[PDB]
Ligand SMILES: [Cl-]
């Protein structure tokens with residue numbers, strides 16, 4: 287049936303057991319199946335953790351980083367990550383429900399032109415593989431983003447590809463603790 | 471006018487100056503323009519270097535990792551990265567000419583069924599955002615790769631998207647020092 291084993295602490299390769307233990311604690315007692323999946327390839331698990339940590343340090347706000355991640359997961363057609371990021375945006379960030387709804391639905395953010403442009407720029411980045419074009423780039427800057435922010439969106443898109451494509455490949459089952467955030 | 475400044479050591483953000491110094495030395499006295507572009511966003515430059523170092527110790531061989539990078543740069547239409555990885559493959563792997571020519575055009579690899587499937591798998595990942603299908607996934611295992619290798623290909627694709635998409639957006643000028651390798 288499954289292409290991949292979703293690893294537990296018990297079955298994961300020794301050198302990632304300590305990381306899965308950390309993940310489980312940090313998540314209040316469960317391992318999101320994305321991590322259990324990436325445990326199959328410790329360099330892929332390592333990349334996902336490490337880039338996550340670099341990305342937090344980037345030129346975007348934590349809300350803007352979630353704008354990038356949710357929009358990418360929706361554009362990439364990845365249910366697991368739409369659910370995972372929704373849960374993070376609610377519990378970690380307490381994102382306004384209207385912002386969250388818009389991002390999940392890939393529809394306009396009416397309250398905040400800045401974030402709405404960022405969302406739309408992320409879609410264009412993904413579909414064009416970065417060749418967004420003169421007009422899309424100029425609209426990105428007009429609302430106050432910079433060339434640095436542009437490359438930090440690419441960074442988020444790059445991170446989104448690792449987890450969205452991996453979950454797309456595995457058809458990763460959605461943990462019971464994420465099931466309520468599933469799109470829909 | 472260009473959308474991005476290509477940074478020098480002098481113009482870069484303070485916290486990446488040392489990275490640029492190290493890059494310049496490693497390349498014998500020049501900075502590849504991707505690096506001067508990424509310098510605009512220190513975290514994107516740092517991700518590119520960090521993930522490169524992780525990818526180069528993954529479950530694929532050095533040849534297989536370049537199969538993935540070049541195939542991805544061709545598929546993503548990124549001219550800079552094709553030249554950058556052709557350079558690395560010639561210098562640092564001594565890749566056979568038939569292999570290198572086939573990667574650079576995404577034409578089949580006739581001498582090597584295993585690398586031909588890897589190359590095809592990579593294209594499928596990129597064109598299907600990972601939904602490569604049961605049959606493409608089975609051909610991948612039957613050739614000798616593992617589920618682990620498959621996620622390490624996704625890893626390579628993700629790293630390629632960072633540099634390919636950035637270079638695509640900037641239309642990064644190709645350094646004179648890389649020109650011999652273009653096309
Ligand atoms: Cl467990």
Ligand SMILES: [Cl-]
Pocket residue numbers: 477478479480501
């Ligand atoms: Cl310089």
